[PDB]
Amino acid sequence: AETVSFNFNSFSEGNPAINFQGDVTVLSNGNIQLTNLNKVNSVGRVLYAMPVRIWSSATGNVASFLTSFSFEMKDIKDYDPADGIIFFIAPEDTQIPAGSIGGGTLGVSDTKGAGHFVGVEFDTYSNSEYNDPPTDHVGIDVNSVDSVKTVPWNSVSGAVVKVTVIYDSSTKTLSVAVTNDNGDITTIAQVVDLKAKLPERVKFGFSASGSLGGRQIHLIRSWSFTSTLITT
Amino acid sequence: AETVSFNFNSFSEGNPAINFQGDVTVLSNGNIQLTNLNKVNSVGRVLYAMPVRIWSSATGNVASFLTSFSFEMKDIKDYDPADGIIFFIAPEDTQIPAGSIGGGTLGVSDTKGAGHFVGVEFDTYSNSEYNDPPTDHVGIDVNSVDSVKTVPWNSVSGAVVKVTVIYDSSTKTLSVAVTNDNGDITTIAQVVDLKAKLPERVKFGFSASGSLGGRQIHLIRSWSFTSTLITT
Amino acid sequence: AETVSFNFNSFSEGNPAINFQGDVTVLSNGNIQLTNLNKVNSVGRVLYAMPVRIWSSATGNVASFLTSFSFEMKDIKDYDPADGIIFFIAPEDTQIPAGSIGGGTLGVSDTKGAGHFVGVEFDTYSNSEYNDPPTDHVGIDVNSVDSVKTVPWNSVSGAVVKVTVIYDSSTKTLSVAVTNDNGDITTIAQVVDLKAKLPERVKFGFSASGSLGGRQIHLIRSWSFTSTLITT
Amino acid sequence: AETVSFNFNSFSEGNPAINFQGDVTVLSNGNIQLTNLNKVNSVGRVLYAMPVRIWSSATGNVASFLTSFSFEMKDIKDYDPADGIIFFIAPEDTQIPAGSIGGGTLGVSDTKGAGHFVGVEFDTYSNSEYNDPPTDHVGIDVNSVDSVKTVPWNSVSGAVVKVTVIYDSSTKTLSVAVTNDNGDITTIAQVVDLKAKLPERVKFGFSASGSLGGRQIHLIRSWSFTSTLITT
Ligand SMILES: OC[C@H]1O[C@@H](O[C@H]2[C@H](O)[C@@H](O)[C@@H](O)O[C@@H]2CO)[C@H](O)[C@@H](O)[C@H]1O
Ligand SMILES: OC[C@H]1O[C@@H](O[C@H]2[C@H](O)[C@@H](O)[C@@H](O)O[C@@H]2CO)[C@H](O)[C@@H](O)[C@H]1O
Ligand SMILES: OC[C@H]1O[C@@H](O[C@H]2[C@H](O)[C@@H](O)[C@@H](O)O[C@@H]2CO)[C@H](O)[C@@H](O)[C@H]1O
Ligand SMILES: OC[C@H]1O[C@@H](O[C@H]2[C@H](O)[C@@H](O)[C@@H](O)O[C@@H]2CO)[C@H](O)[C@@H](O)[C@H]1O
Ligand SMILES: [Ca+2]
Ligand SMILES: [Ca+2]
Ligand SMILES: [Ca+2]
Ligand SMILES: [Ca+2]
Ligand SMILES: [Mn+2]
Ligand SMILES: [Mn+2]
Ligand SMILES: [Mn+2]
Ligand SMILES: [Mn+2]
């Protein structure tokens, strides 16, 4: 069958395999820093350049994928740690929304919180305008930052977090596993019909954002991905 | 929260953290060989010594767990490569069925293919008495080797296989991601209520078996596990 | 390497990973309260249920281990705050000494003060019968509550204490760093050959005690542990 | 009792509490990058500005200390991952050796491998000129990179390592506990007279180096320290 798979142990600006959008910047240690600590309403996104085919309109089949990545979020002096990082899937021509206000939109939606994407968010600030839970959380988003489902989580400054995501095409189930710093794990699952929400070709990536007063360090340390679409 | 996690890069007889049942043998390279090549109807199981509490009768909560392990099956000169490996969850007092015929019972069920366990199998021989699909396969078994659900899969002799499992207590969804040697991934998910099928305290482990004519090498190379139960 | 590791940010009765002996009791705040304030000569002990293999008779190797925990001792109205907490290591068959008088024996030794254990004690009452120093103290005990070595210390009521213990198998050196409420650190080191004083398999734990007129609150707030044995 | 204690969760150039020497550099994520990947024979060092009094010529007492820190080392394309990082203690007037060839001297010793310092090195390259073990290692150095004692160790690219150090004035013992990423811990201890090797007031710091063909990322993520000297 059709299989797309890669593995980044460190990133490097200049690699044609990765699209850099917004305030993204590659540190000299291989980490990807998504936002700019000095800019207002900063929004940075990194995408895997090669578009992936998650479903064929010919066979009707949808792809199954396995992906895991590690990130870090650290507080900075005199700024509210906001708003988070989001692993998303969007049309192959996706771009930071025009006139993006950063903040609660996480760099993937308009002001209303709407957008054309699907993804797992690690939200560290509660936005009432988007019906955010009263605590840090992990949520499954489907064309909106108004999560379909969320689970309480805790973001620890300077802590490296590992995430594993499995998407089963048969059950159309997206299940996430978050391994916090102290060993504890957080999981959240949701049935999402990728074929009905996204186009045949999509791009996977990360996105982070901030506001005027909400800012923090968003880092992607590593990321491996494998998808398999049955072509028959 | 209540977290239980362990990581095995290699095994060594003598470790109080591991129970050996049956024809289990520890190779000098640190790998565990589950069955005996010179015995008829051989059965070998290896369990995590300590029982794990997957759910509380007090709070009614179920634990979530993330676990990944790698195994290897290799053909030997004249036996049909059978019968396969199985990752299971069973009562803390779990033993190799009395008078086990090994073979297609995978060392966890009786002759009718019934038993008290929940598990993911890597069945390599088609047993029609247990309604096995015509090809090798991965299946989710619930108190029976007559899988509740299966997916076509291929066992490549001498190939190292990586498996990742996620159990989201919330949705009670068990998702499995198999990474074949050629990079292709196979996934399968199924909703199982561990709280309704298993007792509060259970044990996790692996089991493998063979017949008189069906024999092959079953190797468990590594295994890390983490489970978290919300206690409140 | 054979590694055993665990981490407790909170405890909860029912966890198969923990063994309770004596007047132990888990508070709703997740804390462990070792003794019973209404019993005479009360003795409470908590142990990690799984036996750790500190040395191998095959290789002659001994394991190194790093562990840290925090406890709290708080005075109660008409009893002398006595007599302390001891972090011990004992044979896996360890039990509270028959006919234990509690008190200065800290729940690990007989009346003479003898026992089969190794431990770091935090003594809050001076027992001339066990050659206790005139002040509160931290001591390294080897098969007796008549410490091999002690160092002055000061138990502050209601104060949270953090302790870190390192055991280097090479030098057979056991070093302890106690961090008091006011920031100051107290340390004490001692060479203890664990392979000569204890059997291959042991259990780790905490014990506290009191007498008729000597009572106080003994709390265990957290406990993280890790040991690695070189298997080769 | 005279206590000194600081705790850095992140570092930022411009902070008067920390001295910088060589090619040090503070990344936008708060990390300290000791070496420059584009320079030959690069040496970078970072010290706590305020000198700490470890012993007293008046009382004769020697301070005990507890200090833990976490670092990360990662491989860069087309370069041998060398030579390592070393947590050292030196005279308050300490400076990078004149005409420092970086490389195996780790930026603390001259070509012969001699210098006026005491430290724990995490060596990733085997320099035969300094009698290095054939593999990666941790070693206790006393005025020389020809470690008084060393222990096998393994540096994992991109992995965050946690170190804990304890110095017991009484026994003059310096024990080190290194927690690897896979959970495994490595320990090493040695008796060292800080009073006979160093002056009354010293400076604590970190140092890293590289050569022409040997380069890698040396990152210091966090550092907490507490030393107490009995003033009587
Ligand atoms: O505290 C972080 C949140 O900021 C919100 O925006 C604030 C902004 O930070 C503040 O400087 C001022 O302009 O008021 C704004 C409106 O509340 C974001 O909307 C929110 O998403 C957080 O980032
Ligand atoms: O071919 C492997 C399968 O063998 C089945 O049992 C065989 C047995 O191996 C053979 O010697 C003879 O007795 O016929 C039996 C019936 O097929 C097992 O039942 C099956 O699980 C495979 O191992
Ligand atoms: O006061 C604390 C100490 O009490 C000692 O026992 C006392 C006992 O409490 C008292 O009722 C009377 O019987 O005298 C005993 C001997 O002094 C314990 O032995 C000692 O360990 C402290 O707990
Ligand atoms: O592989 C790194 C080691 O390099 C040694 O120096 C090399 C140098 O890198 C190379 O360019 C050439 O000059 O040969 C030298 C001698 O081997 C360092 O001495 C050693 O410490 C490592 O850094
Ligand atoms: Ca938000
Ligand atoms: Ca079968
Ligand atoms: Ca006493
Ligand atoms: Ca070297
Ligand atoms: Mn949200
Ligand atoms: Mn089957
Ligand atoms: Mn004592
Ligand atoms: Mn060395």
CATH number where D49 lies: 2.60.120.200
Pocket test for ligand 3, best of C211, C212, C215, C218 (most atoms within 8 A of CB): C211
Which residues lie near ion ligand 5 (Cβ < 5 Å)? A 83, 104, 123, 125, 127
Contact assessment for residue B148 and residue B190, using Cβ atoms and an 8 Å cutoff: yes
- What are the phi and psi torsion angles at B25 (to 5°)? -145, 135
Q: What one-character DSSP code corresponds to residue A96?
A: P
Beta carbons of A179 and B227 less than 8 Å apart: no
For chain A, how far is it from start to end, CA to CA, in angstroms? 8
d(CA C217, CA A73): 39
Resolution of the experimentally solved model in angstroms:
2.9
3 state SS of B100: coil
C-alpha to C-alpha distance for D93 and D19, rounded to whole angstroms? 12
d(CA C18, CA C49): 5
Nearest-CB residue to C177 (from D166, D183, D185): D166
What SS3 class is residue B64? strand
Any atom of ligand 1 within 6 Å of the Cβ of A129: no
How does strand B185-191 pair with strand B173-179?
antiparallel
Tokens for D15, please give them.
């902070």
| HEC per residue, chain C | CEEEEEEECCCCCCCCCEEEEECCEECCCCCEECCCCCCCCCEEEEEECCCEECECCCCCCECEEEEEEEEEEEECCCCECCCEEEEEEEECCCCCCCCCCCHHHCCCCCCCCEEEEEEEEEECCCCHHHCCCCCCEEEEEEEECCCCEEEECCCCCCEEEEEEEEEECCCCEEEEEEECCCCCEEEEEEECCHHHHCCCEEEEEEEEECCCCECEEEEEEEEEEEEEECCC
* Residue nearest atom 10 of ligand 4, based on CA coordinates: D213
Q: Which atom of ligand 1 is nearest to the CA of A83?
A: 23
Q: Which of B86, D68, D41 shows the shortest CA–CA distance to C68? A: D68
User: For residues A36 and C157, what is the distance between their CA atoms, to the nearest angstrom?
Assistant: 47
A93 CB burial (10 A radius; 0-12, 13-18, 19+): exposed
- Chain C residues touching B1 at Cβ < 8 A: 9-10
Residue C138 β-bridge partners: C122, C151
**Are the beta carbons of D227 and D65 closer than 8 angstroms?**
yes
The reply to whether omega before D83 is within 30° of 0 (cis) is yes
Positive or negative, the CA dihedral D103, D109, D113, D119 is: negative
> Domain range spanning residue D50?
1-232
Residue D73 contacts residue D225 (beta carbons within 8 Å): no
Q: Please state, in angstroms and rounded to a whole number, the distance separating the CA atoms of residues B4 and B229.
A: 9
Between CA C93 and CA B120 the distance in angstroms is 36
Experimental method: X-ray
The SS3 assignment for A130 reads helix
Testing ligand 2's pocket by substitution, the residue of B211, B215, B218 carrying the most ligand atoms inside 8 A of its CB is B211
Number of domains present in the structure of chain D: 1
Residues of chain D neighbouring B7 (CB-CB closer than 8 A): 182-183
DSSP secondary structure letter of residue A9: S
Q: Which amino acid is at C123?
A: D
Q: Token pair of B173, please?
A: 């969804």
**Is B106 touching ligand 2 by the criterion CB < 6 Å?**
no
Task: Return the bridge partners of D118, or none.
Answer: D89, D142
